[PDB]
Symmetry: D4
Subunit: 146 residues, 8 copies
């Protein structure tokens, strides 16, 4: 990323609401040159989205957990993340090295809800489920723009 893009990325990561005019002033660009650079940052996938961060608990998600899953049949391509991505309670899904194949961050209303979610996940994608429950989120979603 060139110097200008870095400035733009910095600013957007600091606050996604920063305006084209604000960005233009800060990067030393005209508004049209910024709007072009931002659009390109978005289409190259550098900027992924602008969703406001919402407190999960405030919307009823009183329980969150990391869920580690393992294909019940590891010898075939499991396609677990595609098979599960319609599940709204799954906030994220990663393949990982180690004992399990994927880790997912999951949010539910209650313990009972979690248990139900786990069963739905296991049947939907034919996987086993290991749950690590979160007691508290100290901080999150802190991006580091070097």
């Amino acid at each position: 990323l060139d110097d200008i893009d870095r400035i733009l990325v910095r600013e957007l990561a600091a606050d996604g609401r920063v305006t084209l005019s604000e960005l233009a002033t800060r990067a030393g660009l005209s508004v049209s040159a910024v709007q072009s650079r931002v659009r390109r940052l978005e289409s190259r996938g550098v900027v992924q989205g602008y969703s406001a961060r919402i407190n999960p608990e405030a919307v009823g998600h009183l329980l969150s957990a990391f869920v580690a899953i393992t294909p019940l049949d590891p010898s075939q391509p499991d396609d677990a993340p595609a098979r599960l991505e319609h599940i709204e309670e799954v906030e994220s899904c990663y393949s990982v090295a180690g004992e399990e194949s994927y880790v997912m961050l999951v949010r539910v209303a209650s313990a009972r809800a979690l248990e139900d979610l786990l069963q739905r996940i296991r049947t939907t994608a034919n996987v086993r489920t290991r749950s690590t429950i979160i007691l508290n989120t100290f901080y999150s979603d802190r991006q580091h723009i070097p």
Copy 2:
């Protein structure tokens, strides 16, 4: 959260850039009302931030990982998340049930950088470190607003 705050939160989650005017028509209010509710939602910590979400790889973060940490002396209050908070490579920090005390999502430039970070974490919070490297992110930060 009354039905109206519900819509504001929804719209904000969909796109943090949504303007006061667009919120006013979508909600059915004035922009001064919207503005006030929104400032309220922010102060109550319901709306936590507006940072744009950046592809970590685009700014040089080629290696991501979960790091589970455990204090070397569990009998003392460790204050590990507070002690590590200034470390920018730490995106998120959770206390969890189970064997380890906290799990963190960490991003770094490379394997070598990861090894440096792990040592810095251990020295800074007096903890042991167990790292689960992410191979791929299939999807993430998918906030569910029921």
Copy 3:
């Protein structure tokens, strides 16, 4: 649970032998009004039972164990607790977060009855079994009513 139900519950927890007449006095109620409260507390599963607690060792159960079970086919609802509940040696059965799906407190005459019980559990509910043997009970059955 209102203030009066709390007094009743806190009285019954201290000793399940407190008479309805003693409850009424203590709670500020007529005896016919306590009667109807208590019946409602029972049918609402708040008050679960009045069994006097008996030392399991004193009646032949010289070996107790925690048994963690994990369904062999996670892809399907196992209904393990329901499949196992006629097994009288099982004093309690909880679903849990983590590697295993359920933990049970189990009471048996000997190590060898333990071994038989384990197999009967595994065959009955199609699960694997991992047992943690209890060496001593220092205290138990302590109910705290805040």
Copy 4:
């Protein structure tokens, strides 16, 4: 435990509210002879108590957990159960064979009270702590008298 003590124990286990007069009738005894048997059963820790069992959830304990603890300095007697027994959230405490030294059943208001309880346990008794969170109790407190 003779045949008559067995009848008494089996009667008290079914319902701790059975009167001495009912016990005598059922056991074949005078009421003064049952009285002295029952007193002896109590002081011998055979009959441990008469508490009515209360649903922990119904009284604010919306999170239960099993907590496995392991002394930080195994070379010395830890007396952990004794050091922890004034902690009212601890319903039960067992020494166990295996990796950890003790397992406790613990009841708390929330995940965050759980986190506080854990630290207080670790500091009080100088142990490490590993928790397994209970999602659902299917049945418990089932006493079997052969």
Copy 5:
């Protein structure tokens, strides 16, 4: 075991070769009595055998190991010790609590031989195998007769 059987067992444990006459003076009986008690102790399974203890290394057993096994289908009665009994490299076989179902002490000529044995065990009893290699035997078969 009366005091006299006690002495016989003691002497036998000290040296299986002890003769009837030596037992008679040490016990304080005739040799026909001794003889009878001894045959009794053997039949009741108290005295289990008289095999001399051989250094496994001297007969070519250069590698020893504990092997913990777990049936691949825990829901079936595995009969693993019975199924493996004819395998001569298996010196001992125990059912144990915990994760694995049985632990065995096994002796073989070499590492390669160990790998062959492990496969034979797995095929024969339909189990998985987890091997803990012995590096040194400091002392063994020390029978304590109180």
Copy 6:
């Protein structure tokens, strides 16, 4: 071992009571040549002893366990087996590869006895203790003379 020694070792391992005359006949030797060969087998440590195998349970050892121990300070030579060999309840002690440093087979009268033994072991040799309890011994002490 030459052909004659093998015959002698075979016989002694089959039954430690076999006489010099029996051995002489079976190996084709005179009694004096056998008594010389046996004595040499003993002093070279090929024959380790002649203790009769006694049923642990018959002498009061109702509980046996494998105990895995780890020096509390692994950086210094622990000398654990020498430090513990005066403990009569320790039947055997092995250094092993894997997570723990040694495995010992242990025999005690009861669970309470075990717990006490474990503490004594931990203090005596400054080690941590992991106990795997034996539920049943299917067979043991089966030597294999190839």
Copy 7:
């Protein structure tokens, strides 16, 4: 080996490039008889190869890992090494004692290529897979000729 091979191997271990002639003078022997000894060491498998060691990183292998594999049905001869031999990213393959059956050192271009390779390995040999990613290699390939 003999006194003269002990030198051929020691010298060839120093660097394979050492010429027949240099070997002769160092072995006191002759260029021909020394070249037949070397031809033999090679056929005896003592000398396994002459490859120069190349930095894997320099050739685009930026991600290395140990991969522990376990047959999905351990009850049959899995033949995994042979079945996986054709896969070039596998540098080495060992059977080991412990929980997994084999470990392999593996070299790939990227985290995404590792994820692909792992799937390829699981499918080819019908195994599950647990990877330990290398962050740095401080030294390697150091053979000690005693």
Copy 8:
């Protein structure tokens, strides 16, 4: 590397013994300029060495193992690889992600020598040690030049 180094490395990886002259003709270049490129590949660390690979077994290394080590105080820079570098039985040393900090491939004469070596490693670098013994190496040192 460039188009010409891609061949020097590929050829040297085939067998280090390939002479300057053979390299020239295959690189289309000259014996001198080709010998300076090779001198550079060597100083660039691309070509790390020319040792012939010797069967460790053939030189009396009958016991090989992976040794995973963890600093006993992970809160400080342990410098373990460097501190252990002088130990010749260590063939390789890697930092890894996961529970332990490093794994080393180790070669010794015997189980007893391994036990000694492990102690030596723990004392030198102040670490604990977990060994995974190799039973067989099916193939090794296979470098793939893409």
